[PDB]
Design a protein around this ligand. Structure first.
Ligand SMILES: Nc1ncnc2c1ncn2[C@@H]1O[C@H](COP(=O)(O)OP(=O)(O)OP(=O)(O)O)[C@@H](O)[C@H]1O
Ligand SMILES: Nc1ncnc2c1ncn2[C@@H]1O[C@H](COP(=O)(O)OP(=O)(O)O)[C@@H](O)[C@H]1O
Ligand SMILES: [Mg+2]
Ligand SMILES: [Mg+2]
Lengths: 470, 475, 236
């Protein structure tokens, strides 16, 4: 049908279309306009309905600047929520929120598959019992804080301490050993990361599969809100239609609440909490709940998430933090030591396998590791105050082994091959546990500490020590 | 397309009629004052007034213009002082309009930029050696009130005489007499050859205050797109933020966390994202920006400072206690960082200025302890002496930008230990006498630094500084 | 109510004003055409300092002066009037009062009428006029009260939405053109010994020299009660 514009209110837009047969909530309306005379300005705009009003008026939100909108101009309604283009054809390019590629390498054909963004979460019927652990191929992650597939992961790491290297390695491993593809959706600052990912993941070829979606701070509130949901619809296509054993990734959750900070400005309604929208928990939940495992296909939408807010008691970080499953921390002081990845023994949950299923050895090893690290920390405190030489023999042996344990944590990443020159190593979780057990058992107390660096397996440590000409 | 004003008050009028008005279109009254239409209700228009609203009366006729908030740009504006609406302020006749462009345009997007690798010299030894800045980078400057923010900005604009740059200085809510003083201080030193100054003083209505930085960045963007490098300085964004708050409150929009509405992060980030380093496909332009933010009681943790600091690529923090104590300029290493720095900095400075940072930090900590405790070890005392000389070198006087080559040479002389013999107060005399000696003896070193961008022949530099020590007279 | 002076008219030259007070003259010189602020708590002598400065200026320099009382205590206004009458200074000066028991609008506009007196003196007689203002704090409070009555939404600490603008106008019509200075000395009270309330901060942004008075000095034998270290002037 066709309806005319009657009101404009800037960012909230509040275009009150007068129409014959109204479109449902979340439906898409597209405006086409031409410069009939010198005064008028041609504009092509898309809007999303958000609220019905008295008589025929339907409130909307515009995804771009409304400068040049004139009362009386005709509007056409598409018939369905804003349709992202998705499928094989769309793989391998960077999109805006609406669906056009920002880089002008190519244009998506009209014939392609287009799916609506807003979909109800998977029913309770299709869910699956979740006990299994996803393998990351990173020794520390597989030893201290494993990730439950289908669950949200948190990584509290400052920019420049290895965030980009860590996520590149994760997506490379998940595309090398698994059938999983990744999806990235940023909202903040500058995307210099585009060229780093271009280098490594285009050498790997995964760039052709990862369908990045970008809309950043310069965009109006509506696009900054709906970008994450476009990113999620990218994964939803794979899980529903493809149904491959693709345990895919999506790399942003909290950024939706960072955009929700601006969604509070998008509302234009009664304030609540600390200026936040009333529907904060519901609005975040609608996104978070679409990430699930399922029996329709072997697709776990497990996501690694960075939280820029980093304030505990604030309502939005608390509401987001309630949904998180596992947590990890990246700190600069550990980066100083040359131990990479710079992850510390902080962990969360991940007990679905160990010790729940059997997991006895894994759980006991992890507990001993954390205990030894904290004992080494207090011993290091004592050493500075008075001196190590006065420590007893049995207490000194703890530091002796702790040095090796601390240094073994480093892993020679595959992505680092283009800078360091190391080919890179992938480790199975069982191999990590089995190999590390001997370290706690003191099989290799005599070996020099420097051998325990940037190696995948314990035999590699032994051979490196040998190569040092012992 | 004619209408009548039906309500007036504190700068926000309303009008009846104007069928074909376009949101954001410039509108004008029989009085001649310009207005920006912002809200279009079903039968009446909400107009924000840009000018004196006292003359307006209900029943006044209002006329639309047909332009969407266009600000004139051109070559004529260089050296002038203009209003955000583009009107001349300093007399000297009307400026010629090459072309008119809106101020609501989209920022340069992703995959259309490039990593920053080109240096921008401020002329201050401490800044250029410790916290470099690159072209296209956004560096925020924060400090306590009366700490020299404007002095640093004027030093940067003055030093930019040598290197091709179009500098635009935006005065937001600043006192008019200070604006005129800065205008004259730029008239001397010839800085008005390239600089454009945009002013909207405290007396101006809040809409003009919040519109000014947008107009300045819009003016700079034209030279960006033609290919010329630009350096824009906002004297104080806090005035824009406050003027925004006031307009929203008068329009009855509910406040956010503080009295500020929720929009302010979008408002300021839309402004700051518009500065970018372009790629070869788009002409390779650049727009550096150096925003300023006011700090009360030296407490960084606040709504506006964190809100803006989340946007920029780095920041520099100036302490008032050090400044008043006699350390001018004063920067704290702990709070000041530049994330884009290191790639723009020329290799010569990168090689020369490695140990200076560690010396400054370690010495300052040790000096704190020493003033706490008298008794010390000999190595700590030698470190204290070196740090004292280092502090003496870093001092710089007013309105005297120093060329990079003399900076790297004097930093080399400081770090190698040649300067250590000179007493504290004699260090400054040593520095200026060494500049004169460099002008006298070591010209080839300076030319090799200019052309090569790398440290010159080290042996001859050692001989030259040794010869200066042999000629210099202590005390 | 009159449009402000323009950019081209204003001058930039700096001239020092001598007061004859040892602390002020030594460590915080005042400047012709510049705005000078007096900060401090209650019972420290700000009014005594401003009154004795008026007397000293009229005794030695002999220039015209204007005094604006924004919501002054009737008792203090009457005592000031009697003291100046006894001093023989009233003939050289002029005073305008806006009493506390008046609606807030009059207490707001009284400073502007005093400024208009100094304006006519400076425009037609072309000499170095001075303008003393009792307290800007009550001017801001009156602005807030008028806004609340008119129905505008509050902001900051209950303050009116348009604060910075009004303060800016009141302090930017006070500018030294080539003809005359219109130097001003202004006193402000710190509500809770915190220099963060919106009115003290907004006025703080506008000052060339600030002199802050401490209660500890006032209770000590040291008169006047001016803290040397925290009082500064940009003309030093
Ligand atoms: N390196 C320096 N050595 C000596 N004096 C200096 C130096 N840098 C600045 N000053 C002086 O310090 C004062 C700084 O004034 P300026 O206007 O720059 O302050 P500001 O911190 O920007 O404050 P505001 O925001 O109120 O303008 C001036 O009097 C200037 O001469
Ligand atoms: N220099 C001074 N000489 C004598 N008495 C003083 C002096 N300064 C302050 N006082 C005492 O303190 C009071 C100052 O009152 P006032 O100036 O009104 O304080 P404030 O300005 O803080 O309200 C006087 O009544 C006087 O008794
Ligand atoms: Mg300044
Ligand atoms: Mg008093």
């Amino acid at each position: 049908t066709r309806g005319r514009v009657i009101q404009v209110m800037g960012p909230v837009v509040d275009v009150k279309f007068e129409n014959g047969h109204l479109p449902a909530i979340y439906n898409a309306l597209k405006i086409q306009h031409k410069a009939r005379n010198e005064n008028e300005v041609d504009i092509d705009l898309t809007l999303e309905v958000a609220l019905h009003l008295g008589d025929d008026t339907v409130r909307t939100i515009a995804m771009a600047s409304t400068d040049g909108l004139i009362r009386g101009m005709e509007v056409i309604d598409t018939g369905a929520p804003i349709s992202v283009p998705v499928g094989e054809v769309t793989l391998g390019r960077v999109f805006n929120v609406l669906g056009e590629p920002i880089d002008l390498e190519g244009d998506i054909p009209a014939d392609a598959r287009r799916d609506p963004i807003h979909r109800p979460a998977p029913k309770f019927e299709e869910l699956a019992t979740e006990v299994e652990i996803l393998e990351t191929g990173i020794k520390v992650v597989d030893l201290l804080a494993p990730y439950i597939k289908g669950g949200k992961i948190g990584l509290f790491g400052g920019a420049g301490v290895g965030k980009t290297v860590l996520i590149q390695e994760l997506i490379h491993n998940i595309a090398q050993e698994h059938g999983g593809i990744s999806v990235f959706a940023g909202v903040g600052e500058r995307t210099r990361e585009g060229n780093d990912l271009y280098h490594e993941m285009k050498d790997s070829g995964v760039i052709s599969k990862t369908a990045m979606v970008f809309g950043q701070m310069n965009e109006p509130p509506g696009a900054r809100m709906r970008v994450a949901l476009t990113g999620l619809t990218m994964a939803e296509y794979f899980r529903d239609e493809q149904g491959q054993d693709v345990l895919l990734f999506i790399d942003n959750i909290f950024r939706f609440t960072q955009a929700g900070s601006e969604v509070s400005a998008l509302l234009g309604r009664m304030p609540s909490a600390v200026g936040y929208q009333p529907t904060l928990a519901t609005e975040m939940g609608q996104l978070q709940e679409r990430i699930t495992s399922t029996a329709k296909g072997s697709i776990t939408s497990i996501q690694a998430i960075y939280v820029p807010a980093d304030d505990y008691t604030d309502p939005a970080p608390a509401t987001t933090f309630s949904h998180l499953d596992a947590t990890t921390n990246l700190e600069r002081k550990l980066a100083e030591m040359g131990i990479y990845p710079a992850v510390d023994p902080l962990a969360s949950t991940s007990r679905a396998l160990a010790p729940e299923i059997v997991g006895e050895e894994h759980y006991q090893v992890a507990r001993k590791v954390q205990q030894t690290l904290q004992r080494y920390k207090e011993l290091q405190d004592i050493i500075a105050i008075l001196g190590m030489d006065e420590l007893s023999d049995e207490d000194k042996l703890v530091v002796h082994r702790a040095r090796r344990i601390q240094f073994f944590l480093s892993q020679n990443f595959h992505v680092a091959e283009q800078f360091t020159g190391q080919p890179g190593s992938y480790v199975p979780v069982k191999e990590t546990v089995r190999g590390f057990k001997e370290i706690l058992e003191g099989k290799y107390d005599h070996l020099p500490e420097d051998a325990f660096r940037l190696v995948g397996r314990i035999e590699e440590v032994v051979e490196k020590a040998k190569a040092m000409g012992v | 397309d004619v209408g009548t004003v039906i309500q007036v008050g504190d700068g926000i009028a309303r009008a009846h009629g104007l069928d074909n008005v376009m949101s954001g279109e410039l509108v004008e009254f029989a009085n001649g004052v310009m207005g920006m239409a912002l809200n279009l209700e079903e039968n009446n228009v909400g107009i924000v007034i840009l000018g004196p609203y006292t003359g307006i009366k209900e029943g006044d006729e209002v006329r639309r213009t047909g332009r969407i908030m266009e600000v004139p740009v051109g070559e004529a504006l260089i050296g002038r002082v203009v209003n955000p609406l583009g009107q001349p302020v300093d007399g000297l006749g009307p400026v010629e309009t090459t072309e008119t462009r809106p101020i609501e345009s989209r920022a340069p997007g992703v995959m259309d930029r490039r990593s920053v690798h080109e240096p921008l010299q401020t002329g201050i030894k401490a800044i250029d050696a410790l916290v470099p800045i690159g072209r296209g980078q956004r560096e925020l400057i924060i400090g306590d009130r009366q700490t020299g923010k404007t002095s640093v900005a004027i030093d940067t604009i003055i030093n930019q005489k040598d290197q091709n740059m179009i500098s635009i200085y935006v005065a937001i809510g600043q006192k008019e007499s200070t604006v005129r003083t800065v205008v004259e201080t730029l008239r001397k030193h010839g800085a008005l050859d390239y600089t454009i100054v945009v002013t909207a003083s405290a007396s101006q209505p809040a809409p003009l205050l919040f519109l000014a930085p947008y107009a300045g960045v819009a003016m700079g963007e034209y030279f960006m797109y033609k290919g010329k490098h630009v350096l824009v300085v906002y004297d104080d964004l806090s005035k824009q933020a406050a003027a925004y708050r006031e307009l929203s409150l008068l329009l009855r929009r509910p406040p956010g966390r503080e009295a500020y509405p929720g929009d302010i992060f979008y408002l300021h980030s839309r402004l700051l994202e518009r500065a970018a380093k372009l790629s070869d496909a788009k002409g390779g332009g650049s727009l550096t920006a150096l925003p300023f933010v006011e700090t009360q009681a030296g407490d960084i943790s606040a709504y506006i400072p964190t809100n803006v600091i989340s946007i920029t690529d780095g920041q520099i923090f100036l302490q008032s206690d050090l400044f008043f104590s006699g350390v001018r300029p004063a920067i704290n290493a702990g709070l000041s960082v530049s994330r884009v720095g290191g790639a723009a900095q020329i290799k010569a400075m990168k090689k020369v200025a490695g140990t200076l940072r560690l010396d400054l930090a370690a010495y300052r900590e040790l000096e704190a302890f020493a003033q706490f405790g008298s008794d010390l070890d000999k190595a700590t005392q030698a470190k204290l002496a070196r740090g004292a000389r280092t502090v003496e070198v870093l001092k710089q006087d007013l309105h005297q930008p120093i060329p990079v080559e003399k900076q790297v040479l004097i930093i080399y002389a400081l770090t190698r230990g040649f300067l250590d013999d000179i007493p504290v107060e004699d260090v400054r005399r040593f520095e200026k006498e060494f500049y004169l000696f460099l002008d006298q003896n070591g010209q080839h070193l300076l030319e090799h630094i200019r052309t090569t961008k790398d440290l010159p022949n080290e042996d001859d530099l050692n001989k030259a500084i040794e010869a200066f020590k042999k000629t210099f007279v202590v005390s």
